[PDB]
Design a protein around this ligand. Structure first.
Ligand code: HEM
Ligand code: HEM
Ligand SMILES: Cc1cc(N)nc(CCc2cc(CN)cc(CCc3cc(C)cc(N)n3)c2)c1
Ligand SMILES: Cc1cc(N)nc(CCc2cc(CN)cc(CCc3cc(C)cc(N)n3)c2)c1
Lengths: 363, 363
């Protein structure tokens, strides 16, 4: 064994750790044997519902780049390893969107599909997030979100067509084992909450006609638990405001709105020493938090989020767990020195279970 | 040899590299022999004026944490390896302040004193910067700059006494080889430029009565060139505005002025979601750049500085030199995602010549 030996070692490590945390310590030997025989028989093994749930939660806890980890143990885990058809996959994805959105009171949720077998995917999801805007470039200038340009082009190869507004919802797109091409389904608009961006004090701000979607649902990462590869396992939290105001709407390679923001808030955008970009960033970011709160859609500001992560740190030390983190992702892109994160270091070691990048099926 | 063998290898590497850049390639063999014999004879070697100047410039070029490196080759190098007395040291430090300040049109300058011999310092400087404010804690609350608390306490052990304003200038303090205690000399106020902080639009801002000094002159790092240790070698640039507005005046462990800023600019400081800290940071940072420019004192904003560093990058590739950098120090503490630095990675390898930390003589 080499491939199956890797599986065995990962399973031994995970089960011990998992059962210890669950207090099931005395059950480890028996479970480990059953697993051993099941690998010898089938070349793999199946997680119990408890192992899967706790595995997914552990994976979140170990995600070095995530500032929202305080709430790892409250992850809502939906077990969909039973799906076999594209209608079932589609309906599970619609359901995830609905139950996670929860009328605006967002629930951190993951839906878990059948894992790879021989490195053979059962389900291959093409979307980066379940809800995202399309992007086009035939230059009347760019249209929409440039980060979606390649996926948008692939969808349109498959017969979909966007309206070419700056906010076209992409369809869900995924491929089933045995099919050469993926399928796509348009998102029901009643499922997707969107928030118009207004400013608490500046009436002109609505003239920008900005909006964003309520729930970021990452759908392109692999969840690995105990040597088992769940390549299809979409998860969501709620947004930190800076992700929208400082990146999605502000980056030059994304929506690039800072100059327009400066104009509506009535400052000149001519001199670096005026810090007009910094000023525009703050008002935009204030508008985002205000708009989400007014609509009743969950969101966290970067200061509150950092305070929560300080508690995660304290909780980790208190439970004897080593803390891991990626300082470059944990600091907010706005006023990072105003948070405690900026003034300490973190160990960027990779602990499993965890979420990992995988190759895109397209481009 | 072990200690002297380390010296030899460092000297071989530096001289080759230095002469290659200076075009003196054909002179390397002869110089290398002379050095070899001088190490065999005296246990060390003496740099030529050209080697020292270029060594100091290389050291700046290799400083991973510095965003101002575009201008490395224009460093003004003052050779003071001839000093033997404390009056000479004091006068060299006064002269550095004067020539670097240059009536506000700041010249990046380094003054280089005699190097360590057997790891024995000839001159030991206690100041962190040549110009810095004292700090006290007998709590009527804190007074001045908390980062200067330990050094301030050491100066006052030696007979100096501060006025206990929030902006007391510390005296110069340094120790000569052979003396048990250091000496201190008060800074002549006519040498030190200071800038009152006002806001371009908000008249009330002067009510905070903030100020800062014009020139940051690092005096506690070791310059290493070709195996020779210049432990005493103060250097200066001009400030990037964020260093003053986002750190020195803003940090809770420093002057902690953000709540007072919020009050004078007329925003509430009650809710995280109002981003009052971010807003206050921007106006404070605008005030800093405006105040330095109005007084005719050199300063750079973080956007211009990042543009300059992009040119350093391009210059490095163009000259076939590997680029090194520390991403965690290069990004500005304000709107870092608005600069190109944030969106790329850097190799944090240590190349010599370079500037290094050394142990404090006090605390
Ligand atoms: C509850 C609300 C949540 C918030 C506010 C939050 C916040 C964030 C932020 C701000 C980032 C990085 C963005 C950046 O630095 O530019 C991030 C990254 C990440 N978060 Fe969370 N998160 C949350 C929930 C979750 C959940 C439920 C999971 C998974 C179960 C998760 C896993 C991750 C992962 C894996 C990354 C790194 C992604 C990558 O490498 O591309 N987070 N989180
Ligand atoms: C010309 C104007 C200069 C500017 C605007 C500039 C800017 C900066 C900034 C902003 C930092 C780090 C502060 C932070 O990230 O929080 C820095 C660090 C540094 N700079 Fe420069 N710098 C300049 C000139 C110089 C010169 C002349 C030298 C030496 C010859 C130098 C060597 C360094 C070093 C060694 C560090 C790291 C210090 C440490 O590790 O504590 N810089 N520079
Ligand atoms: C250059 C750069 C730096 C940096 N720190 N971060 C980024 C990208 C941030 C990013 C990237 C991806 C895709 N790899 C995905 C995200 C989404 C993270 C996320 C995930 C979840 C579940 C909730 C939530 N609020 N946020 C952020 C780029
Ligand atoms: C937590 C933390 C992060 C960070 N990026 N930077 C710091 C400190 C910044 C700092 C620290 C020291 C002392 N080690 C010295 C400086 C001064 C750098 C400097 C040096 C020179 C010569 C010019 C200039 N404008 N700035 C900055 C702390």
């Amino acid at each position: 064994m080499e491939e199956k030996e890797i599986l065995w070692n990962e399973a031994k490590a995970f089960i011990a750790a998992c059962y210890q945390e669950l207090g099931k310590a005395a059950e480890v030997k028996d479970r480990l044997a059953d697993i051993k025989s099941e690998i010898d028989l089938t070349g793999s093994y199946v997680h119990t519902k408890e192992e899967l749930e706790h595995g997914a939660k552990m994976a979140w806890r170990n995600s070095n780049r995530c500032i929202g980890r305080l709430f790892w143990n409250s992850l809502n885990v939906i077990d969909r390893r039973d799906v076999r058809t594209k209608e079932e996959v589609r309906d599970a994805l619609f359901h995830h969107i609905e139950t996670a959105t929860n009328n605006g009171k967002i629930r951190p949720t993951i839906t878990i599909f059948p894992p790879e077998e021989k490195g053979e995917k059962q389900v291959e999801i093409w979307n980066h997030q379940l809800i995202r805007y399309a992007g086009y470039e035939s230059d009347g200038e760019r249209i929409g979100d440039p980060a979606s340009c390649s996926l948008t082009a692939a969808c349109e190869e498959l017969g979909w067509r966007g309206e070419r507004t700056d906010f076209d919802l992409l369809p869900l797109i995924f491929r089933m084992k045995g099919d050469e091409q993926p399928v796509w389904y348009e998102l029901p608009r009643s499922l997707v909450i969107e928030v118009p961006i207004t400013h608490p004090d500046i009436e002109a701000f609505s003239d920008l006609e900005l909006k964003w979607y309520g729930v970021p649902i990452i759908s392109d990462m692999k969840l690995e638990v105990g040597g088992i590869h769940y390549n299809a396992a979409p998860f969501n939290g709620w947004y930190m405001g800076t992700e929208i105001g400082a990146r999605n709407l502000a980056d030059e390679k994304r929506y690039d709105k800072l100059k327009k923001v400066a104009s509506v808030i009535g400052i000149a955008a001519d001199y670096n020493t005026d810090l007009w970009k910094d000023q525009a960033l703050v008002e935009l970011n204030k508008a985002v938090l205000h708009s989400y709160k007014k609509q009743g859609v969950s969101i966290v500001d970067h200061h509150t989020a950092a305070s929560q992560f300080k508690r995660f740190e304290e909780q980790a030390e208190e439970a004897g767990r080593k803390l891991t983190g990626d300082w470059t992702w944990l600091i907010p892109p706005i006023s990072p020195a105003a948070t405690h994160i900026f003034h300490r270091s973190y160990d960027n070691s990779i602990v499993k279970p965890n979420y990992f990048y995988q190759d895109k099926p397209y481009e």
